[model samples]
Target chain A: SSLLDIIYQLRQVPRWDGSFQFEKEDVSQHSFSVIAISHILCELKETLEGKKINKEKLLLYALYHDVTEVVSTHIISPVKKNSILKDPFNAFREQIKNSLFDNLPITLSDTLSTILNNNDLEIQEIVEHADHVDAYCKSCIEVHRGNKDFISIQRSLGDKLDNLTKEYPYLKEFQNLFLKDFPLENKNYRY
Target chain B: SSLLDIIYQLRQVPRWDGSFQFEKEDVSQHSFSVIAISHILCELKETLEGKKINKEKLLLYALYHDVTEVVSTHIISPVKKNSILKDPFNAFREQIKNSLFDNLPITLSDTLSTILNNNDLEIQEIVEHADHVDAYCKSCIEVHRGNKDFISIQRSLGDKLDNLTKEYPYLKEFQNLFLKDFPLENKNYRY
Candidate 1:
């Protein structure tokens, strides 16, 4: 497949099963939210802690974190956690990555890989947090939309956010200040 | 109003008239797309021209470029271009910016204004170009989704791209290598 084809595949991936039944958001939209949140959080952390964070790397990771889902599809956390499927899922994801990289220009592919699977601990930690934040925010949005199905998911993610706050103090600020008002109640997705 | 309230309002804006009637996307989602495209394009331009670009500023611009829409609402380009409205729109937009900044933290507001209304020609040109590219890509996606309304938009944007490519050779590679495949066709946005 061509690089363009891979992107098309990503637009097809949904955040959840029956995603359309409630609120519709494609993988591309989800990626955008995660990247924006990560960018803000990274800058906030740097300011508060007076420490440097690699903004470029963090943003890149946020952008491509779920790109493999285009090929693997959106594997719910439960299925992905299955011991039997865990290794297989990872292998499948890597296989898709290899194919996509093979088709992309070398410079671009190198950049994509670095963002998709960075080995840096700091970068990894930030991206993982951003991913969870995106999930929590999504659940929150669903709840705001009058969808009770996501209430439990929201609570679960809320607890996770709390736990993360202990490890990354900046997260609490992000959650309280930014995420609290998400799924903008007044926002109209239609023209 | 709270900062969160302002952000929530953005979700209410749409990129085009009855945007959801054809393809579903909100101002927040559109902002995300622009930011992603701008980030990639900025890097490409920097590499090709060997000039330093303020990536952070560009990303901020992409993120909040349409923020005033919360107050101004999503005005179509045709209406916005009317000479009668042009001066009024600029004045009104400035009014909204002042209010938003007044409510925002001093540090954050300062940064936002700089990115939103930068006097730097280089930064303004790049951000404006990225904005059009995002618009063009959105139209291309609509075409992929079987919406004929966007065909004309796509043609118009195509011409604009050609013009931009003349002024900035860097855009040609971006268009040929990446944009040609936008709104990834295979991407499933549903459950």
Candidate 2:
């Protein structure tokens, strides 16, 4: 029940301050979007480079990236800006990784820790970029729904996305494709 | 962008009719839990039988299982009981599965379709039961939050769960473990 319990808790935690113009998001949903976006970006990179991506490893990373957040709620980045919170936050994350994942099967547990550690620079970049891209998409939906507050959020996210694409030029094409439209065939895209 | 687009669309589709007594759920979140529960059940069965579960395939199945709903939306099972709506509902599902997944890279797209088709009866049973278990958990959360309407939902779901466990016998352990309590350590469990 260890990992299952962790996942159950994740389904309950809300994203984006809980309240929303139309609908709210939970950590579970956020994790899935991140996985989907990460896979697409990885595949796009593979497509452009004519090289194979480790789809298996990348998807596994995406699956467990936010798992530690189950032990730790989605702590906002701004809140950890101060050293006081940042130090404890980092320490608690490590502690939980050891306490909770230690008993899991070695390979499975290690993969989980790899995602949480974010030490694999290449894979980390993909996941991080995918996360921001997902946020930008969500913000766009909010704006389309007349949530003006998200307009500014979208701007800031767009700027960050620009920087991300510039830093990782390969991601530019994927970003362009995503920003072009909602991308789903069905038009019932509501939040 | 085919499968990725559907995943993105899932982020916007709310669970429990897009509203809640205390919080809302999206298809993305629901998918994650289903995957989580599915994995746990599969793993438990493997452990008890002293056999290996196809962890990778099982996870992929859980991930894409309900993705077709992105196009069709979450049509409640009971509502489709009538042949009139049932026939069209199924046709629409197949239409979306082909329309949205056809353009994806061959292997990836094929895997997506495989999950939607649910051809493996044993694995399908685990995923199906896990889904009902997740629903029961969600109902319990609502009831805890004083949403009395969920009391009946929980009861019916519990009855179905009992039947599933009786049919499978193996699922009882997983169900009992899940019904025990929230697994997170901090006691910050909330819906």
lDDT, residue B104, model 2:
52
Tell me, by TM-score, which candidate is best.
1
Candidate 1: tens digits of C-alpha lDDT, residues B101-145: 543444456666686667877767777787888788778877887
At residue B103, give the lDDT of candidate 2: 39
Q: Per-residue CA lDDT of candidate 2, range B24-44, in tens?
A: 666777888887677667766
Q: Rate the local accuracy (lDDT) of all candidates.
A: 0.71, 0.70
CA lDDT, candidate 2, residue A153: 83
Error of 1 at B62 (Å): 1.9
lDDT digits (tens) for residues A122-157 of candidate 2: 777788788888888878778777788778888988
| Model 1 C-alpha lDDT per residue in residues A1-191, reported as the tens digit of each score | 24444544556577687443366667877776666667667766777778887666776677677877866778888789799999998888777766565444455667777766678787777777877887887787678778888888889889978988887777877776776657555533222
DockQ for every model comes to 0.26, 0.32
In candidate 1 chain A, what residue range of length 10 has the lowest lDDT sum?
Answer: A182-191
Off by over 4 Å in 2: A1-5, A17-23, A49-57, A81-88, A101-122, A167-170, A182-191, B1-5, B11-22, B50-54, B82-88, B102-118, B182-191
